[PDB]
Every structure is written in structure tokens, then in C-alpha cells.
Amino acid sequence: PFLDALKNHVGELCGETLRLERKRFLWQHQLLGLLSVYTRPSCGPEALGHLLSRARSPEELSLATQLYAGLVVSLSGLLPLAFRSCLARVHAGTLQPPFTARFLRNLALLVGWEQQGGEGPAALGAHFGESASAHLSDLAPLLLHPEEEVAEAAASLLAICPFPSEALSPSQLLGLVRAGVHRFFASLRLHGPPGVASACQLLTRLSQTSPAGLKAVLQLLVEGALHRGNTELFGGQTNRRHTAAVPGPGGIWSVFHAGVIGRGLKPPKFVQSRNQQEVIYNTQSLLSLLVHCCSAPGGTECGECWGAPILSPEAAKAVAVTLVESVCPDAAGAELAWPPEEHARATVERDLRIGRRFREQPLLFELLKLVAAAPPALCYCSVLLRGLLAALLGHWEASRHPDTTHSPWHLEASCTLVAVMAEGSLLPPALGNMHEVFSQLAPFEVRLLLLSVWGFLREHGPLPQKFIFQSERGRFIRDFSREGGGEGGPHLAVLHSVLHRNIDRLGLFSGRFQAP
Amino acid sequence: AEMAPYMKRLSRGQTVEDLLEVLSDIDEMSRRRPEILSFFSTNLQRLMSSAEECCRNLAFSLALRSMQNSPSIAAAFLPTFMYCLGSQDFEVVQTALRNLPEYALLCQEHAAVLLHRAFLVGMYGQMDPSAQISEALRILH
Amino acid sequence: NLREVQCLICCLLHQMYIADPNIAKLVHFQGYPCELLPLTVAGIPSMHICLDFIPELIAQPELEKQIFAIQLLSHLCIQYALPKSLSVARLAVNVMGTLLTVLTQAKRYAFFMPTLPSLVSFCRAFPPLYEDIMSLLIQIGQVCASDVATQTRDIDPIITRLQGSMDPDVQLCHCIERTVIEIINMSVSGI
Amino acid sequence: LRSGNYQEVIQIFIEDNLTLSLPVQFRQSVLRELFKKAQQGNEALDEICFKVCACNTVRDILEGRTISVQFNQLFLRPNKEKIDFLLEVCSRSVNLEKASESLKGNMAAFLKNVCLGLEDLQYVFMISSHELFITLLKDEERKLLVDQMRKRSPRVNLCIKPVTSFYDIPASASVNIGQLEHQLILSVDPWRIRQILIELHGMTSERQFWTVSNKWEVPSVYSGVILGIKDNLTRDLVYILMAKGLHCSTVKDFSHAKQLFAACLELVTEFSPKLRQVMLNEMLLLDIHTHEAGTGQAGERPPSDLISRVRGYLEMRLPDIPLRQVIAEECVAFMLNWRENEYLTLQVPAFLLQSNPYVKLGQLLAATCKELPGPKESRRTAKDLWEVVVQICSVSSQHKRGNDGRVSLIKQRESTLGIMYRSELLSFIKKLREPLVLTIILSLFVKLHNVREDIVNDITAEHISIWPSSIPNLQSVDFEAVAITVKELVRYTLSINPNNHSWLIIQADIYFATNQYSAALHYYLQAGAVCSDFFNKAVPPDVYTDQVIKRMIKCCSLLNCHTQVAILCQFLREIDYKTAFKSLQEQNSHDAMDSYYDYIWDVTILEYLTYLHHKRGETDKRQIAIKAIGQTELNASNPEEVLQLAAQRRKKKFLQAMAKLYF
């Protein structure tokens, strides 16, 4: 009778077990142990769940581990059933949110404690990792919880929880990708760059899965960053009162006006306000997450370090493709070979649209630099570079100012664009070092230089090929010796004529354009 | 003592044959003297989310009859019913909606969250539960 | 002191409406803010004859007139529960379904955002419409769900099957789930 | 740069950091040349390259512009010298006695986010011990940063030893009995258990101490033979150690079970060799499960001595030992799992091959496994496999003398005209992990489900169809049993490789045949997401065949999503305009109408949409259709490359949108 009275009194029994008295806790702990050994269903998963849903200190986790160790010698299949009971209580209307936040924290501490040491975790055959990985689809939506502590605990758990050795089903893979990107953006908004470690760890851990997961992570990560709800972090974007004030001009005479043009004044117009430190450091956090995701496996620890790990030319290709998708979805000029100059006068609407997109969100330029440090990648962004270049050509055709510093953004966009295409091994080093004169020229002069750039890309196209995969230190290299043009003859001639005009001011910088 | 071997078979059961045969036996001996289903609560919870259709239907019918004996235990099968309503097997959800209005009456304190989850499962997931939830509404008053 | 002015104005409007119903029809065609819709319906008895032109008001090509007709009909059905009110309520449900068939996404949001509490009022007034009401909800729910899948979103509500200036589609989905919550809690506490 | 004195350039860049003199774009150009000429062949430049990158990024963070992706690239693998040089450059870069408050704030924020970027703790330590970091931040934020850095991987301490509420010097016989019993139940170390047993038998007189824990379980034949030892101490010891070893093997504690069975081995040597051979069979069980669980699918090979001992166990043949069939289960499962296609016909003689049906089924399955790499028929093996599997799924009595229903194959579990029961067949195929034999068995059960059970029109997909078509005695096989076992086999085979497109297609077809259109659409989309990298590339036509796309169209149509039907029927090799027009004519769509008009690329279907919207009164969806037609991307007379590339862009976006909705 004592055992099956405590069968339904186990709730208060374990509730007063966690008090850590002088000698009472050992007595009630053995009472729980003999209870869960005795009872015919089990009553061990419920006891383990109650010890896990209310543990707020390391020693009561320790008592939970002693309970499991005392139970594993007799019963079996305890931890999976305990986690089923816990997560079913979480997803139902019970287990009020401090309890589930605490439980997810205790689970994170336990499964992190497994993946360390070996004197203690190998003694208890708990297998917290496999049991936690079995419930991963049940555990992903907890990143979407309204309470911040539950979401933070779930983020820490999913950051530390190992994946199945079975690999991961694509539906729950995609769902984990959605949970990761949303948690990254939400923790970036709420806390900041301190507080995204769990989400970045989860995203960079399931980015190193099968490559479909890598493309999914990169795509959702850098199209969610350009969404309206998240682009503010990375840069940015009656009758009574009518009749009370109708005296004088009315009366027995007609009113003065004839109507209202629209609904009246067009608002009072909104003034956007940001601070640059948060902008630059959220950008730093996102580019750090991308450069972790787009990096190769590595893990060799060879040499004396001091080196640059490779960025994968396939991950940057995915980033380039989804960036082109986000900016210009059109397919009129999707060929990677540049058309003639006069053809730029046809698709001027698209060029203005890419110019507007680059002007509104600075992060696009930043992403181009990410595309830059993987030389087959920026070739896929030939449409974007062509459109932005054509917009800059239009601006310098329409410019009437004597000096190019009167338009800040267009000068910065031109110099940044040619610098990025010089990063991506598209232009020669001789011709790619021209932007340092752009700050002190005339608009027609920088126009002629950009037409020289356009003509060079006509003559030597930005094809995915013509890069050799040099294998001793395996990277793609474009060597400008063997194309037959080398440094652009007419192009460097025009650029040298540009220098030879403004000798008065381009004196010191004439040494950069010397022949190699 | 009279219920120990059947529940030992139910707990240590791997194949569909053993579970279905024990479920048939317990249904047969629960047609008369139907107060014996109080012991089969946790195992009926575990087997109610089983993927085979026949044993799942037997477990659901036994759970509903166990409510019919004493409705004070309907607050204990709630997490399993919520899990069956929101699982990814696409047959547990349909068997849950088939038994939705009866359990909606038999719970009557947590019917709001049950019907709420029914609407979101039928709304976000493309299926039509409107008849069952509306019938539960009309007989719930 | 606000209530005294409100009831005095209600008295004057009742006298003017019983003087000639054409003014009442013209005013309800013109429209007034919805926060007056309880006060105007509870306080002016003459709004009973307002159930004569709700079929005519709901047939106008203008859209905000249709939202006003739906809301006014809902408050009238709360006030006066008649076979005429139930018939015009069924007509309202059919009109909302037909406009669900024929509406552009932006116009769909603009039409279905202010209406949906009226469906709570319709369901509270009349039990025999429940499943019909329910059918409309599930339909609107999943079509909005489909719209959520059309483009990327900043909240991803599809995987949120557990419980400011946002995307209109997730706002419409949230309005649908809240009006379902309101219907269910109305049904539970409705005895 | 012309000569090659790069360190001199480094101190110029430090002086420029101090003075803000040189143009920033010149420094970026110099960084470009240093990276490029590092890539031109010299390996001695990466040090200078990191130094100049650090100088450039500290210039950028003084003047408040962005952090380069190269700086994030060079701290993928941090080191002591890298962070030391970064701190040295940051210390030389700012003069604290004449700096503005904005400069100190920028340097402190840069140091803080560099601390956040690091993952290993001692780097956070010596970057927090620099005098610059202490001076530039007040102590509360420094302690906050250190606290959140140590919170990432806490050194938690948990005790594993169980509760022992024991009081010293019990001075009582029954109390000491209880203490030694509780210690005996909890102990896993066999030598300690031996100490408990010898002391417990020493103090007691004639009490048997195996009936002291009812959770200990021994197999029936082994329990029969193990109670035959005469001495009490040896009975209790060998019984409870072998029970504890079996329970530890059950609960995946393999090393402790190895030690327990090793102690059992060293102590059973004296009494009998029959028990010896029994417990070497137990050793074989433990070794097989340890190899299949520890190494797993990532293990290189069996260690080639376990193969010899299982090879022997299949030819022990000593008739005086008890033999549980689960040993032979793991033997045949291990023989089929690791792809040894040589113990099928040359070895394993018929001299009691036919006694164990497990061996016969594994032999027949391996015989069919070797046939497939032959572009040739030779189909005796597939024929007999087909016969033995249609006979195992057959009911014995034709007119059912016992109970009139055939459905009793799932109820009676007797009366099978096979070498084995169907439940043991599921138990056998659930222990196989090799993909080729699993997909052989899956194609077999798919074919057995596709024999017109009463009438069926939708044939489930099958990767190979080499089995005999006509079935003799079709009334013998119970077909609801075939449906149940193919659902078991599919859902198990998803738990062997969830990223296998053919199995996902099979699951989708089985859901489609059972009128579960939503799940069928989910698994079809899932297969498309397996084969193409979440629709980034085009799905190959060997996965989305015309039958598969037509089934997806039917699933979308029966779920009342008609714009999706039109878009999905653009996918076919010949565009099915009839079903498109019939679907678009209806007025009860539960999917979106206008926002799915961006995923269309055929002028004909948009023409019909405009006609339908003009007739039926849609004055606003008509304008959406006009805007879609009037695009300069979907014109009929574009070059073919432009049209096909716009088509594949819309295919990618629409399939991703479907994977957004379902899946």
C-alpha cells in the first residue's frame, strides 16, 4: 500500500526531494528509487522529468544523475521516455514557461557535460546526446517561443546538442534552418552581437552538413538580411473640426476652393535615425557568421599558422546566386558575357533599379566583398556589376559639377565597385588600381575610365572558366599572362592619357600605374 | 494480480502482432467489467501515438471508453492527445480529429487549447478539420 | 458626462430617423467610424429598419461600404436576433466567400482585416451558422497561409504551431487565429 | 614595395594609423597587391599580409568604416602571435592622453567584439589582460564581458555514484544483509560483486542469493541449464553476472558487459564446456553488437577475426548446448550487412542450411543481390525469393477451418505456409542496414502490393521490376497484411537513410494510394529537396518523371489548390493545358490566386487567366494577368536561352514556395 500511495503522491515526494535538507534528501531519493523500481508502468521517466524540470543548481542535477544511475541497473529505456513526457508536457498547455526554460537549460548542461571528460560521463551509460537528437524535430519550434528565456535555453541546447548519426531529414533540416536564421535575427535585434553565439554555432554546425543544407543556410541567411524587417540593422532604408473652422469665406456665398487633390498633405514625412556603431557591429556579426559558413572544413593545424584559410568557391557561388536573385530577378541579360556599350542604353530601367538597391542597403556591397574572396563567384554576379556600372555611367554622363566630390555616394560606389572587381581577379592589377585617382577627376574623365573598364571586360570576359585550380595550395588563380591581351593595351593607353591630362594634381599617384 | 501478465505483454511488446493481439484481448475483457482500464494509462498513452492504424484505433477507442468510465482522468491524457494532434505522421492527426469531439466533451476544461491546436493544424497544414471542430462546438454549447 | 451627450444625441437621431428613413439610409451609405457602431445600434431603436437595406448596401461596388455593411449587420444581429437578421447574415457569409474568390492580396488584407470580429458577432448571435462560419475561417486561413509561403517573412509563422509594423500577411494570419480564439472562448463560456 | 622591405612598410602603416595621413584606398590597393603576390608563389608573405591587414582594419575602426572580410578570414584560426600583434598595433595606434572620447569608444567596442568573436578561452584571457583593454573600459563592463564569455561552456560538476543512506557500524544481522544486498544490486564491477557474494555466503548459512532481484532475467533454456551447478556460490555468481551482462548489453553499456562476460569466462572454465560454448555464443553476441554500435556506419570494416568466429558459430553444431535463435539472427544480419557476397553459394553447405530459415532467407537474398550487377536475366534467384516471400505472406487453410476471416494473418499469427512467421520476417529485415538488400526487399513488397489486390489503378513506384508477374494461387496471400508490412518496411527504410530519393518516392506513392494527398505532396517535395539541393539546381527527370508530376498535380487538385495545379502542370514535357484550364475554371481554391501568378511563364495559361478574369468579373486580377503578360521576360519570341532560364528561375522559386508551405 505504501508504494502505490506514493505512486500518485510522487509529485509532492519529488517536490520536497529537491530541498537538499540535512539527511532527508537521501531518504526521499531512495524512496523515489524504490518507487520507480516497484511500479509496473515505470514511474521513472516522470521522476526524471520532475528532477529535470525544476533543477536550478548543479547539485540537484547531480541528484538527478544519481537517480538515473541507480535506476539504469534495473530498468531500461528511461531517458527517451522521460524526454517524450517532458516535451509532450511542454507542447501542451501545461509546464508553465519558467519550468520548460529551466528544463531546456538543464538538458543543455547535461548534454554538454557528456561531450567532455571521460572519467565521469563514460561511467554512466546515459547517452544524453542520442536521446536529445532523437527529439530534434520536437525541439526546433521552441526557438519560436514568445518567452525570451525559453528561446534562449532552446538556442543553447540546439547549439550544443549533437545531430543524429542517422544524418538529418530534409524537412526537419529546413525547419532547423528557419529556426536558426530567425533566432539569429531576433537575438541580434534584442541583445545584440553579444547573445548570438548559440544561433551562430547552430547555423555553422548544420552548414557543415550535406551541401544542400549549406545552400539553404546561406540563402535564407542573406535573403532574410535584406528583408524589410531586418534591413534596419544592416544600414537601413474630422467633420466637427472641419465645421468649427469654416467661418468667413462661406456664408451665403460659395466656398473658395474647388476640391482636394488627394487626401491632403502627404504625411509630415519620416526622418530616419540610426547609430553607426550598432550598424557596423551587426554587419560584423553577420559577415563573421557567413565567413564561418562559407569556409572549408580545415582542421589540420599544420605549419606555423600566420595563414589564410580558404573560402569555398561553391558556397560563395550560392551566396552570389541568391544575391543576384534578391537584387534583380530579371533574366534579360543573364548571360555572363558583357554586351556592347550601346546595349547599356536599352535596359536602363534595370540599371537604375540595381543602383537604387545598392544605394538603399549598404550590406549588398559588403556581400560583394564576401563574393570577392573566392575568385570563381563574382563572375556569376556579372549582371549586378554591369547594372551598377551602367548606373554609374549614367550618373557621370548627367553630372555637371566640376569636381567629383560634389556627389559623395556615386564616387564611393564607383571606387568601391572597381575595387571589388579588382579583388575578384577580373581586372589586371595595373588597371584595377585606378580608383585612388577618382576622388580628384572630372565626371567625363571617370566616365571614360569606366568605359575603358567596360571595353576590357568585353575583350576579356568574366567567365567562370579561365581560372586554373592550382593544387599544391589548392585555389583558383587567374594569371593575366596567357590570355594574349595581358594588361589592356588601349585601356592602359587611355588611362595613361587620363593621367597625362591632369599632371597638375595626379603627380604622386602616377607611380602606381607603372608597367609590371 | 489478474492484470499483471497482460500489461507485462503490453510493456514488453515489439511487433504489431503482439500489441494487436493483446489489444484485442483487453478490448474483449473490457466489454464487460470496464473498470479495469485504469491500469492501462501510460501504456495506452505510448501506444496511442503508434504508427500502425489498427492498434492506434484500438488504443484511441480504449482511451475514450476509459474516459467514459471516469472522466476525472481526462486531464492526464492531455499531453499525449496534444502530441497526436501535432505530430508529423499524418495519420495520428487524422485519428485524433476523428476522436476530437468526444474528447472535447470529455475534457471540458482544456477544450480551448485543444480546438485552438486543431484549427492551427488544419490551417497551416493543408487539410479540412472544420466539420469535426464545428460539431464539437454545437454539442458543446 | 459623455454618456449624457451620447444618449441625448441618440434621442435626436431616433426622432430624425423615424421622421424619414431616407436620411438613415443615406447616412449608413455614407458611413461613420466603427466605434460608434455599438452606441448607434444600442440606443436607437429605429436601426431595426436598417435591416431593410443591408442587402443593398452590401451590393455596392465600393469596398469600404461593404466593410461598413458587414460590421453594421453584425452589431444589428447582436441587438436584434430575428429570422430577417439570420437571413441577411447568411447572405453576408456568402458575400464574404464570394469576395474571397474575387480579391487582390492588398485589397484582400484591406477587406478582411476590419471584418473578422463581425464573424465572432455572427457566430455569437446564431448557432446554426457555426460550421458555415468555421468553413469560411478555415478557407481564409489556408489561403493566407499560402500567401505566407509566397515570399520570405521576418517572423515565419508556419512553424509557429505551438502557442508593430510587420508584413500584412502575417498580420492577417494572426487576426484569423485571434478571431478563432475569440470564437472558441465565446463558445466555452456561452453556456 | 618595389624593393621588398615589407617591415618598413609595416611601420609606415603604424605611423599612418597614428597620424591618419595616407589615403585609405591606397592602403586597400597595397593590401590587394600583397594578397595577390602572396598568391603568386611566396609563402613568406602571409605574415606581412596579416600584419598589413591588421593595420588596415585598425585604420578602418579608428575612422569608423566597415571591417573587411579578409580580417574575418584571418581569424578563422586564431593564434597567440596574431592576437598579440593585434593588441600591439591597437596599443600603438591610439595615444590615450590626447584622444577624443569617440576614439576610445571605438577602440573599446572593437576590442569587445573581437572578444566576442573568439571561441577559445585563453585568447579571451590575454586579450583581457592587456593594459589597453583595462584602461579603455570601466570594470563593470569588463566583468560582464568575462562573465558572458565563461558562460558558453561551463565546467559543471556532477556526481554519478548512487545514494547510500548508510550509517556506520550497523551491528545488526538483517541490517547488514540489507546493506550488502543494496551494494550487490548497485554493483557493476564483477570483482566487487564476487566480494559481496563470498562475504554474503560466508555470513549466511543456507540462503540462495539469486532470487534477490526480480528484474534480473535469464533466457529460459539458459535458465534451465544454469540452475544445474551443484555449488551455491557458483550458481549465484554465474547467474547474477550473466543476468547483469545481458541487462548491460540491453542498455548499451558494452564495455562493462564485456568485463562481466570476461569474468564469467574465466570462472566457468572449471565446471562445464557446454556452458562454455553457450557463453562464447554470448561473447559473439556482445562483439557483434559492439562492432555494429560503436563503429556504426562510419566503421571501416569488421576486424576480420570476428568474421572468423561468427563463421565458426554457423558451423559449431554441438547438439548438447542450448541455442537461442537471436544469435543466428545477428549472425545472418551481420553476414548480409557488411556486403560479404561469398557465403551464399560456394560456402555454407546445405548440410543443415535448411534447418535455420534465417540462413536460408539470407542466402536467397544474397543470391538475388549478386544478380543485379549482371546486365542479363539469370532470374532463378528472384523467382525463388518471390515464391518464399509470397508463401510467408500466405494463409494455410484455404476455406479457414479455424476462423473464417483471412485477416487472421494479423490476428492468429499461426497458419502460414512459409518457413518462418511474418513477424520474424519483419524482425529480420529490421536488423538489415545495407541499402541494396533493403531496396531489394522494398521492391519485392511493392510488387507484392501491386498485384491488383481487388482492383487498383495507381501503381506505386518501384526502382527495379524483375520479379515474376503472374502469381499462382492469388487467394493464398493476405493483402491487408501486405499493406501493413509494406508500411512497416517503408517507415523503417526511412530510418536507415532519410536522404534517399527513391524511398521517399515510394512513401509518397503509398500515401497517394491511400488517399493521403497532403502527405504524398509532402514526401514528393521532400524527394525533390533530396535530389536537388533544395531546388537550387533543376530536379533530374529520373526523379520527377511525368507520372510523378502528374501525381503531384492530382494531389494539388484534390486539395483544392488550382493555381498550383496550373503552375505544376507547366512542369511536364508536354504542357497539359486541359487540366490547367479545368482547374483554373473553378471557384473554390484554398490556395492563393494572385500571388501565385509570378510563378507562371506560359503565355497561353496567362491568356486563359485573363479571359477567365474578364468574363467572371475580376477587374483586378485581370490587371495582374496583364502585368504578367506585359513583362519583357516572358515574351514568346525571346531567344530560347532567355526563356528557359526564366522558366528555371520560376521553377526554383515556385518549388521553394511549395517547400515553404508544406515540407
Curated annotation (Swiss-Prot), chain A:
GO terms for biological process: regulation of transcription elongation by RNA polymerase II; RNA polymerase II transcription initiation surveillance; snRNA 3'-end processing; snRNA processing. It is found in: Nucleus; Cytoplasm; Nucleus membrane. Its main location: nucleus. Keywords: Acetylation, Cytoplasm, Membrane, Nucleus, Phosphoprotein, Transmembrane, Transmembrane helix. GO terms for cellular component: cytoplasm; cytosol; INTAC complex; integrator complex; membrane; nuclear membrane; nucleoplasm; nucleus. Component of the integrator complex, a multiprotein complex that terminates RNA polymerase II (Pol II) transcription in the promoter-proximal region of genes. Belongs to the Integrator subunit 5 family. Component of the Integrator complex, composed of core subunits INTS1, INTS2, INTS3, INTS4, INTS5, INTS6, INTS7, INTS8, INTS9/RC74, INTS10, INTS11/CPSF3L, INTS12, INTS13, INTS14 and INTS15. The core complex associates with protein phosphatase 2A subunits PPP2CA and PPP2R1A, to form the Integrator-PP2A (INTAC) complex. This is Integrator complex subunit 5. It comes from Homo sapiens.
UniProtKB/Swiss-Prot annotation, chain B:
Signal peptide: none annotated. Coiled coil: none annotated. It is found in: Nucleus; Nucleus membrane. Disulfide bonds: none annotated. Component of the Integrator complex, composed of core subunits INTS1, INTS2, INTS3, INTS4, INTS5, INTS6, INTS7, INTS8, INTS9/RC74, INTS10, INTS11/CPSF3L, INTS12, INTS13, INTS14 and INTS15. The core complex associates with protein phosphatase 2A subunits PPP2CA and PPP2R1A, to form the Integrator-PP2A (INTAC) complex. Interacts with ESRRB, ESRRB is not a core component of the Integrator complex and this association is a bridge for the interaction with the multiprotein complex Integrator; attracts the transcriptional machinery. Belongs to the Integrator subunit 1 family. Component of the integrator complex, a multiprotein complex that terminates RNA polymerase II (Pol II) transcription in the promoter-proximal region of genes. It is linked to Neurodevelopmental disorder with cataracts, poor growth, and dysmorphic facies: An autosomal recessive neurodevelopmental disorder characterized by severe global developmental delay with motor impairment, cognitive delays, absent or severely limited speech, dysmorphic features, hypotonia and cataracts. This is Integrator complex subunit 1. It comes from Homo sapiens.
UniProtKB/Swiss-Prot annotation, chain C:
It is found in: Nucleus; Nucleus membrane; Cytoplasm. It comes from the Eukaryota. Component of the Integrator complex, composed of core subunits INTS1, INTS2, INTS3, INTS4, INTS5, INTS6, INTS7, INTS8, INTS9/RC74, INTS10, INTS11/CPSF3L, INTS12, INTS13, INTS14 and INTS15. The core complex associates with protein phosphatase 2A subunits PPP2CA and PPP2R1A, to form the Integrator-PP2A (INTAC) complex. Belongs to the Integrator subunit 2 family. Component of the integrator complex, a multiprotein complex that terminates RNA polymerase II (Pol II) transcription in the promoter-proximal region of genes. This is Integrator complex subunit 2.
UniProtKB/Swiss-Prot annotation, chain D:
The keyword Cell membrane does not apply. The keyword DNA damage does not apply. GO terms for cellular component: chromatin; INTAC complex; integrator complex; nucleoplasm; nucleus. Disulfide bonds: none annotated. TPR repeats lie at residues 1-24, 238-271, 501-534. Coiled coil: none annotated. GO terms for biological process: protein localization to chromatin; regulation of transcription elongation by RNA polymerase II; RNA polymerase II transcription initiation surveillance; snRNA 3'-end processing; snRNA processing. Keywords: Chromosome, Disease variant, Intellectual disability, Nucleus, Phosphoprotein, Repeat, TPR repeat. It is found in: Nucleus; Chromosome. The WFEF motif is required for the recruitment of protein phosphatase 2A (PP2A) to transcription pause-release checkpoint. Component of the integrator complex, a multiprotein complex that terminates RNA polymerase II (Pol II) transcription in the promoter-proximal region of genes. Belongs to the Integrator subunit 8 family. This is Integrator complex subunit 8. It comes from Homo sapiens (Human). The lineage of its organism: Eukaryota, Metazoa, Chordata, Craniata, Vertebrata. The chain holds residues 333 to 995 of 995 of the full protein.
